[PDB]
Design a protein around this ligand. Sequence first.
Ligand SMILES: *C(=O)[C@@H](NC(=O)/C(=N\OC)c1ccco1)[C@@H]1NC(C(=O)O)=C(COC(N)=O)CS1
Length: 261
Amino acid sequence: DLADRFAELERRYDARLGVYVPATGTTAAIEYRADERFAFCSTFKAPLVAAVLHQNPLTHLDKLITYTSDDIRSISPVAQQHVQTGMTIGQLCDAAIRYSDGTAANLLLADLGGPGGGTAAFTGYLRSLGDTVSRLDAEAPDPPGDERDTTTPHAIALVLQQLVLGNALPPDKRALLTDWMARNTTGAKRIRAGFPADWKVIDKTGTGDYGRANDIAVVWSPTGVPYVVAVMSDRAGGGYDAEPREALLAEAATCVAGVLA
Ligand SMILES: *C(=O)[C@@H](NC(=O)/C(=N\OC)c1ccco1)[C@@H]1NC(C(=O)O)=C(COC(N)=O)CS1
């Protein structure tokens, strides 16, 4: 029984854990706290890039964006390296997904445009995909329970499913998004750690205060059967400085993989 295993992990890591895997041909949906709200953290950057791709011709990826000192307000491993030259939209998408770059995400939000520095248009994009649940309210750089900047494992899984496996994006734009997630550098110790090496994993991570650790993935079996895996967690019991625990997500993913293999 998965629910007992998930509950066991919650006690181990003094955590709240949310899990959703959408149903397939032969597997029922896996769900644990799947309709509870958890902070997006950086996981919004995957649908954000989808929004930017959708909104523009593909050659918009070549548009150079300039930025300066006061735009670097959050963890931005790539954008800090290129502040003196600027970065193209394509480079920003790359950084936002593969390095979870905060500045890159803010600039992409600004590119999408509109009220709240792009957060309203980003939320509008999710609504267009039938997601009435998620909301983005602020930029990089939220107390536990607060509904601002939250999604649910259920909602974000269905969004990722449409983006990667469905037809939310035309194939050419879909492949750009899928490739960036495939080449992600931040996810080795999360969902990836729970699935055997002969399963393909693409993902976008999220990490925050109050022990927040997320990962959203699409995985493929050795025979090419895809599954969407959304795992979210926080550790409110440790306060603001509670350490995020990647191992919680690795273990949750291992339990899921055991059911799907
Ligand atoms: C997105 O989740 C974002 N994280 C942050 O910007 C955080 N603090 O600013 C409010 C934060 C808190 C703890 C760590 O960062 C970026 N994303 C990610 C990510 O995992 O996607 C990280 C991850 O660090 C890892 N791998 O442990 C930090 S920056």
